Curated annotation (Swiss-Prot), chain B:
This is Tagatose-6-phosphate kinase. InterPro entries: Carboh/pur_kinase_PfkB_CS, LacC, PfkB_dom, Ribokinase-like, Tagatose/fructose_Pkinase. It comes from the Bacteria. HAMAP family: LacC. It catalyses: D-tagatofuranose 6-phosphate + ATP = D-tagatofuranose 1,6-bisphosphate + ADP + H(+). Keywords: ATP-binding, Kinase, Lactose metabolism, Nucleotide-binding, Transferase.
Length: 318, 312
């Protein structure tokens, strides 16, 4: 089989990756020495969890964003080992660490701000991104902006995509998302869960179908092709153009839900790339999300459990 | 060859997280993070570089975190000649939160037999360009227990003095072997732990303890007594070090500074009074500092002059 020369590929963006350090502890002794033998150190960031799920699904994918220093080199080594292709922009600063302490039933995290991106690097990445766009049919953007970047930076990136007709799946939240929602350059897919959605509008939460319909049809969400809203265990609600869907998912036994959002993003972006119909797009997004939740690993899916759950998902035009 | 070799067989990339509160089971966001080349022998090195002493750092490093260490040393203009390994140099974490130091220490990499013998050959060639060796810390995972004895054998052959700063079962393996460090520095509690003897602060018990067959063939034995000062044995002579008063802000790495002081004195063939004061002045200087393995040498002279040394 020949190595492809065209544009049939996903680009993931992880603008603030980290070297995640995991410390499983039987107890965290505060104000003392905690000795540990089994530390796991990985290439972290939501965009990289998306990339990993896409590689499992078998989709062509290229990871980019900003890396720097020895820790950026460590990130690169890790992706190389996993046979994951990447084209990160090198910066003068150093990629961050993030700590997760797994102890006594608890995840105690320490999250580093990370490097400052200067002006030449911010501009140069845009030129880099533009080059990468020539060989790409979809772009998945995950996580918040590193320090030093203009708060319109995703809007700039989305604008480059829209000109070339390359669809954007945006997974970011808070002010970051809101900044994009208020700008003229629209992502193709956004995916806030039900509380996030109403918070964005500054309205009380309401699970009623009619109320979710009005919420997603509001001015804030104008021009976004897909809005895909998680209602939790009771599946999802989605709006495609002006068509509404209730996605009904089966009861599952979950273990670790972190990275289900990342897995959903991989499923959406895979379905986009492939031009899957609405039902298929929705079923894939929710299956990957559910499979990951069933795993102890973050941004990992067991593909031999995919088809049985997929067959249990029901999509209704509502 | 007028140079000190420091040995840091198990260094770390130390990460330091100063927090207002450590919120457990929650996200703690941090902005001001300090990442440094860590390990006792590197503290010795930094203190020796402060004093202006010719120094070269060696030991094992691996992967990207090993390169971070080299880079940090390069920036500090500290010379190094490490031996690279297939494993990764470890991280060590310190969370400083509401008066507490909560530490996470990784075991670190395993060293294989080719790497262990590789370092021995590398160390022997380094030994041709140095006049004193300071050894700090314990053995990384995978190394034969005899490894320090092997290193010291090489130094003894070459007539190069070894200042040994290591503890517990690690030090005990050395004491029982034929090839001797020139200087050891166990504290008083540690001294009696070695003999499996009850802790006695008595001077005669101390003279006896330091003269027991476990410590035979060791030139300098320097025992910290706390604020009191020190008790030391040089060949057959016994000294007592009378040290002034200071406020201790951070007493971590005070031993490192004392090793740097003992080792500098050995390099420059200083007399016995001058060595004990210098060992003690650097140790106190560091105890006054917030920075681990750091001394303010402005206060050196006055603190040095307030030190008396008595043969007892």
């Amino acid at each position: 089989g020949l190595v492809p020369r065209g544009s049939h590929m996903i680009l993931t963006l992880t603008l603030n990756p980290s070297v995640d350090i995991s410390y499983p502890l039987t107890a965290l002794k505060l104000d003392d020495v905690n000795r540990v033998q089994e530390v796991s150190k990985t290439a972290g960031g939501k965009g990289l969890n998306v990339t990993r799920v896409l590689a499992q699904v078998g989709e062509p994918v290229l990871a980019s964003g900003f890396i720097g220093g020895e820790l950026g080199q460590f990130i690169a080594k890790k992706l190389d080992h996993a046979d994951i292709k990447h084209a990160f922009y090198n910066i003068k600063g150093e990629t961050r660490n993030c700590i997760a302490i797994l102890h006594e039933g608890q995840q105690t995290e320490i999250l580093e701000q990370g490097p400052e991106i200067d002006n030449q690097e911010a501009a140069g990445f845009i030129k880099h991104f533009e080059q990468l766009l020539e060989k790409v049919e979809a772009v998945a953007i995950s996580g918040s902006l590193p320090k030093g970047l203009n708060q319109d930076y995703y809007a700039q990136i989305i604008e480059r995509c829209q000109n070339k007709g390359v669809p954007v799946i945006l997974d970011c939240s808070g002010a970051t998302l809101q900044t994009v929602l208020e700008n003229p350059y629209k992502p193709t897919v956004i995916k806030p869960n039900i509380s996030e959605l109403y918070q964005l509008l500054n309205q009380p939460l309401d699970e009623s179908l009619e109320s979710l319909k009005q919420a997603v049809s509001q001015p804030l969400f104008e021009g976004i092709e897909w809005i895909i809203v998680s209602l939790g265990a009771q599946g999802a609600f989605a709006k495609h153009n002006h068509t509404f869907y209730r996605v009904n998912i089966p009861t599952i036994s979950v273990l670790n839900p972190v990275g289900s959002g990342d897995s959903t993003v991989a499923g959406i972006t895979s379905a986009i790339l492939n031009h899957e119909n609405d039902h298929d797009l929705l079923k894939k997004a929710n299956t990957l999300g559910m499979l990951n939740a069933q795993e102890a690993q973050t941004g990992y899916v067991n593909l031999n459990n995919y088809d049985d759950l997929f067959n249990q998902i029901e999509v209704l035009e509502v």
